[PDB]
């Protein structure tokens, strides 16, 4: 009848565990419980499921374990991956009723952060490749503990941080791309509305 | 085993709308969910008989069809701006567990005047860059489209690249004082200096939209913004 999951956003960094919480409210007693994974622009599939009380249920290295007393559910993970950023939907299904149909909570979304070992931040001029009068400010190399803000003006374009991997190098990178039309756009102006490290490498060039 | 129809649309303050599912997996139950942020996912309407309906936790507004045991739509005969939500379409054995379809993004809007495709820009990477760390990033820009329906791809040499890429999640509005405002994407292609010195190597980002279909009238002086692909392209430089 009612499914409660954990409300807004759930940041963690990679290699960390995590904890979405699931609790329900159900009449009936024979009852499948559910656990769903949306992942950005793909179907939600199913991830795990169990109908048993106390038993343990693991998948890609998520558990969950059903708590009938508490009415909890909770999808957990030891060590979590990049690849893990996606909606999670915990739902709840009365078996033996007739009419089939379940009944699922808000949703939550895990958004995992990057560990950057090596990180070195920078903003660079970028300029286009047809007609080279346009330009955009890439800020990148910083640690994830680096959060980008939107700016003050009306005229500036801020898009958040946003990790890269290069498979072959094994590295991963946050980028964050600053674009304006306005001849009083600089650089070095850019990202002034946000929390940037002292050690931020301009150059002159 | 279950596919929407059509996978986006665009319609208007008063139109009529029809969101089709087809199961290629024989099943009793055929359901409708809107995907809503807080909401989650919630029940229009569900058929437990091949040949008739019945109404879910928010019926109002729609009306539903199931006339094949494979078939099940979705009929809106005035598309209101509340039914702008992204559609999902499910199927299952009463035992079963939901198959669920890809979606469909519906956009109901007051004037088709302020579809518009994106324009798209490749920006070539910074020398300082080069010699600092000797890696190559190319930004792509993807700006002034409406509604934020687009797809972004880069395709390094003829072939799709995934590694050393990450695009924004969702799009970033333009003018956000506007109700109406048009949308920007970024992208980012990062390669290995050498990669990029090499005046020889193709980069391209391509970006697909999803606007007006065929049977929509355009009663406008500047080209109908059907459902496309916008690109530009890039080659080393030394």
């Known amino acids: 009848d009612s499914v409660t999951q954990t409300e807004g956003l759930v940041t963690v960094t990679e290699g960390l565990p995590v904890m979405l919480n699931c609790t329900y409210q159900?009449?009936?007693?024979?009852?499948?419980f559910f656990w769903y994974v949306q992942y950005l622009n793909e179907a939600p599939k199913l991830l795990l499921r169990?109908?048993?009380?106390?038993k343990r249920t693991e998948h890609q290295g998520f558990h969950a374990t059903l708590h009938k007393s508490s009415s909890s559910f909770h999808l957990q993970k030891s060590s979590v991956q990049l690849s893990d950023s996606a909606l999670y939907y915990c739902a709840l299904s009365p078996h033996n009723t007739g009419n089939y149909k379940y009944v699922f909570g808000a949703g939550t979304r895990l958004k995992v952060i990057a560990h950057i070992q090596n990180p070195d931040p920078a903003v660079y001029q970028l300029r286009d490749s047809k007609s080279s009068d346009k330009s955009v400010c890439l800020f990148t190399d910083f640690d994830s503990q680096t959060n980008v803000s939107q700016s003050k003006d009306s005229d500036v374009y801020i898009t958040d941080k946003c990790v890269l991997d290069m498979r072959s190098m094994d590295f991963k990178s946050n980028s964050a791309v600053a674009w304006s039309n306005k001849s009083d756009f600089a650089c070095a102006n850019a990202f002034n509305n946000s929390i940037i490290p002292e050690d931020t490498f301009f150059p002159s060039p | 085993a279950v596919t929407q129809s059509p996978r986006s649309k665009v319609a208007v303050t008063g139109g009529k709308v029809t969101l089709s599912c087809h199961q290629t997996?024989?099943?009793?139950?055929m359901y409708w969910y809107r995907q809503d942020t807080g909401h989650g996912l919630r029940l229009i309407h569900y058929?437990?008989?091949?040949?008739?309906?019945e109404k879910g936790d928010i019926p109002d507004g729609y009306k539903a069809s199931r006339p094949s045991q494979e078939n099940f739509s979705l009929i809106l005969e005035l598309a209101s701006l509340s039914q702008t939500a992204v559609y999902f379409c499910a199927s299952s054995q009463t035992n079963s567990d939901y198959t669920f379809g890809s979606g469909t993004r519906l956009l109901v809007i007051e004037d088709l005047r302020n579809v518009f495709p994106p324009e798209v820009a490749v920006f070539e990477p910074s020398e300082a860059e080069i010699s600092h760390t000797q890696k190559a990033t190319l930004v792509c820009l993807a700006t002034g489209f409406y509604p934020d329906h687009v797809e972004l791809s880069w395709w390094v040499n003829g072939k799709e690249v995934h590694s050393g890429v990450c695009t924004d999640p969702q799009p970033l509005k333009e003018q956000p004082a506007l109700n109406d405002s048009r949308y920007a994407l970024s992208s980012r292609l990062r390669v290995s200096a050498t990669f990029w010195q090499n005046p020889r190597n193709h980069f391209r980002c391509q970006v697909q939209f999803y606007g007006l279909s065929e049977n929509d009238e355009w009663t406008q002086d500047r080209a109908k913004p059907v459902t496309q692909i916008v690109s530009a392209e890039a080659w080393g430089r030394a």
């Open positions: 159900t009449a009936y007693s024979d009852v499948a």
């Open positions: 169990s109908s048993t009380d106390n």
């Open positions: 058929s437990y008989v091949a040949d008739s309906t």
């Open positions: 997996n024989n099943h009793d139950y």
